[PDB]
């Protein structure tokens, strides 16, 4: 069989759901099995089979439009989507990965990949507005996929598509990468509210490799160094340690090797 | 990002050209290239395409087999060889990127659509 698929709908709104989505992702991304102060790392990517190598979310919306997104899991980012025949994909910035991405929907018929990475300050860009100014939740949620599904039908603005991207990311990978995050969706939803992200969040996702690496190179959970995030206050401050980060964060980028 | 081309010229039947396209800053390099040409009161044709790798090259049927298109993302230039020329290709040839994809499924490469910024179209002509 293919890559596995956990699947979502914006149709039943349960809040509940929504975790057991999240949760499935993240049961997919890793075994656990490595996990480094009670958080579990994701797969290292040398060595890693390409049937192995991949996930796939499929997105229904109220409209009943499919897209099907895939991720890396190794870094749990999304590599690139399939709506109805068409299949696109980031910029694989190195060779290695151009090859990987190539065994994802071999059976779709018109396979792009786009000149830009997925990346946020690239999509900041096209999308004309920021993550900052972007609108998050279920809502968007809901137009993201109609969005996509009709990119394949040249129906849909590049500008509102790397917009509907920089929802779909944040709201699926960021999700699953932070507990926080996650959590953060849930609220937006269990009273169908939408809005933007706040400096909490952003500076986790900008810090999210970073933490990674500080957590896993870190002496019994102290960092060598420290590592500079907001809250929804704007005000600054620094972590020293994992500790605080346990109910934050949930995977880590596989960084190093664990210690005795 | 801003297309130049280079070469073109009068030849003679059964001879070689090269042309090539330097781009100067944008995406080049992430960017697919393709190959037009149109001769007077002749249709549009394609000619050839090439990803960013590039590791996918599509060629006009006539010209399969004879010119091969090539690029150098390091020189930021796109190269169309041309060998073994046939009266059939005298035209104006025009190199054209896509700053959107990397690379495209050929129904889209084909087509000038696809393809949102373009040279200035060096004139080449053969002779017998």
């Known amino acids: 069989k293919q890559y596995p698929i956990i699947n979502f709908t914006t149709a039943g709104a349960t809040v509940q759901s929504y975790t057991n989505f999240i949760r499935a992702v993240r049961g997919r991304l890793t075994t656990g099995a490595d996990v480094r102060h009670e958080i579990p790392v994701l797969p290292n990517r040398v060595g890693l089979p390409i049937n192995q190598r991949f996930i796939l979310v499929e997105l229904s919306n109220h409209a009943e439009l499919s897209v099907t997104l895939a991720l890396d899991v190794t870094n749990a980012y999304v590599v690139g989507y399939r709506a109805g025949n068409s299949a696109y994909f980031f910029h694989p910035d190195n060779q290695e990965d151009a090859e990987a991405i190539t065994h994802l929907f071999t059976d779709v018929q018109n396979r792009y990949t786009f000149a830009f990475g997925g990346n946020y300050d690239r999509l900041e860009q096209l999308a004309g507005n920021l993550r900052e100014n972007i609108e998050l939740g279920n809502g968007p949620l809901e137009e993201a996929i109609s969005a996509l599904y009709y990119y394949s039908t040249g129906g849909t603005q590049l500008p509102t598509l790397a917009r509907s991207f920089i929802i779909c990311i944040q709201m699926i990978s960021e999700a699953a990468r932070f507990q926080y995050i996650e959590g953060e969706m849930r609220t937006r939803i269990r009273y169908n509210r939408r809005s933007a992200p706040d400096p909490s969040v952003i500076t986790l996702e900008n810090s999210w490799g970073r933490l990674s690496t500080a957590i896993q190179e870190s002496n019994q959970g102290a960092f060598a160094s420290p590592i500079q995030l907001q809250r929804r206050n704007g005000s600054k401050f620094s972590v020293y340690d994992v500790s605080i980060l346990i109910p934050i964060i949930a995977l880590m980028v596989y960084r190093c090797a664990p210690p005795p | 990002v801003q297309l130049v081309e280079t070469g073109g010229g009068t030849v003679q039947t059964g001879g070689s050209l090269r042309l090539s396209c330097s781009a100067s800053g944008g995406s080049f390099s992430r960017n697919a290239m393709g190959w037009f040409r149109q001769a007077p009161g002749k249709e549009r044709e394609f000619v050839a395409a090439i990803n960013w790798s590039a590791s996918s090259t599509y060629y006009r049927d006539s010209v399969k087999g004879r010119f091969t298109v090539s690029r150098d993302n390091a020189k930021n230039t796109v190269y169309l060889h041309l060998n073994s020329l046939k009266l059939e290709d005298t035209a104006a040839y025009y190199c054209?990127?896509?700053?959107?994809?990397?690379?495209?499924?050929?129904?889209?490469?084909?087509?000038?659509?696809?393809?949102?910024?373009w040279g200035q179209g060096t004139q080449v002509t053969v002779s017998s």
């Open positions: 054209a990127g896509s700053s959107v994809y990397a690379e495209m499924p050929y129904a889209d490469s084909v087509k000038a659509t696809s393809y949102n910024y």
